[PDB]
UniProtKB/Swiss-Prot annotation:
Gene: PARP1
Localization in the cell: Cytoplasm
Active site residues of this protein: 214
Effect recorded for residue 91 to A: Increased affinity for DNA damage sites
Residue window of the full protein shown: 662 to 1009 of 1014
Impact after mutating residue 88 to A: Poly-ADP-ribosyltransferase activity is impaired while mono-ADP-ribosyltransferase activity is not affected; produces a mixture of short and mono ADP-ribose chains
Documented effect of changing residue 219 to G: Abolished interaction with TIMELESS
Effect of residue 28 to P: 1.5% of wild-type activity
Name listed for the protein in its UniProt record: Poly [ADP-ribose] polymerase 1, processed C-terminus
Length: 235
């Protein structure tokens, strides 16, 4: 008459769904394990948060996640170059479907505006950018942000809104160039995956619409989710 899951994972599930805890965990088809806050993994992840602040974030919990057969789906793109661990932020309500059915692309038929690099899956190298999409208030100041291994390969680098139908030949992803970027010389390797956890600096990119680098992929197989973070927003 009890759940066998760790306490933080239980608090995480009650958060997502807003009926037995174990039954709702099974609905996700995702192995959610709590990263040790002392481990090298937690230290790098917690450093990526603090360095990419430009609304201050404390890392409550770090979960190591693995959605059913997302490995298999992504295997072709695990060969690609430029694999970066990047932020995706969404409303807490959406995380039931995300972990269930992964990150998806809205259809062209479905009306869409504010999208400035077409219908794909967007990501940030700065956490304060992805955090905005959590839409957390002082009333409920806990928000969820994903870390995903995005297989970007040859990036088609734009600095102005452009509705993308198809990528130029040889390009695998789009990268919007922002006014602010992580320090290129402070980039490290986590599992052969580039983690851009340098401090926010002036990119040098002048004539740009964007304040922050956005990364977009137009194939769901190019994404392989690694970590989910539970974040307290300090106002
Ligand atoms: C009914 C239903 O649930 N779904 C059918 C429709 C697709 C839903 C889904 O799976 N989605 C996941 C992928 N996604 C994005 O990636 C997306 C879009 C978009 C537009 C403007 C701006 C951004 C942005 C730009 C910088 C940074 C960040 C985002 C966002 N989170 C960020 O961290 C954006 O991202 C769309 C929604 C599932």
């Amino acid at each position: 008459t009890k759940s066998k899951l760790p306490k933080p994972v239980q608090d995480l599930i009650k958060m997502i769904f807003g009926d037995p805890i174990d039954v709702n965990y099974e609905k996700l088809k995702t192995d959610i394990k709590v990263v040790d806050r002392d481990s090298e993994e937690a230290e790098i992840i917690r450093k990526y948060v603090k360095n990419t602040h430009a609304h201050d974030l404390e890392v409550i919990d770090i979960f190591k996640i693995e959605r059913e057969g997302e490995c298999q789906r992504y295997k072709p793109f695990k060969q690609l170059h430029n694999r970066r661990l990047l932020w995706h932020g969404s409303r807490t309500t959406n995380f039931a479907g995300i972990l269930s059915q992964g990150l998806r692309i809205a259809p062209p038929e479905a009306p869409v505006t504010g999208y400035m690099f077409g219908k794909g899956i967007y990501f940030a190298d700065m956490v304060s950018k992805s955090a905005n999409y959590c839409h957390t208030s002082q009333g409920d100041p806990i928000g969820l942000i994903l870390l995903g291994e995005v297989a970007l390969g040859n990036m088609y680098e734009l600095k102005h809104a452009s509705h993308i139908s198809k990528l130029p030949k040889g390009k695998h992803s789009v990268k919007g160039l922002g006014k602010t970027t992580p320090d290129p010389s402070a980039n490290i390797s986590l599992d052969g995956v580039d983690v851009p956890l340098g401090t926010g600096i002036s990119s040098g990119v002048n004539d740009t619409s964007l304040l922050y680098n956005e990364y977009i992929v137009y194939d769901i197989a190019q994404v392989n989710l690694k970590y989910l973070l539970k974040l307290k927003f300090n106002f």
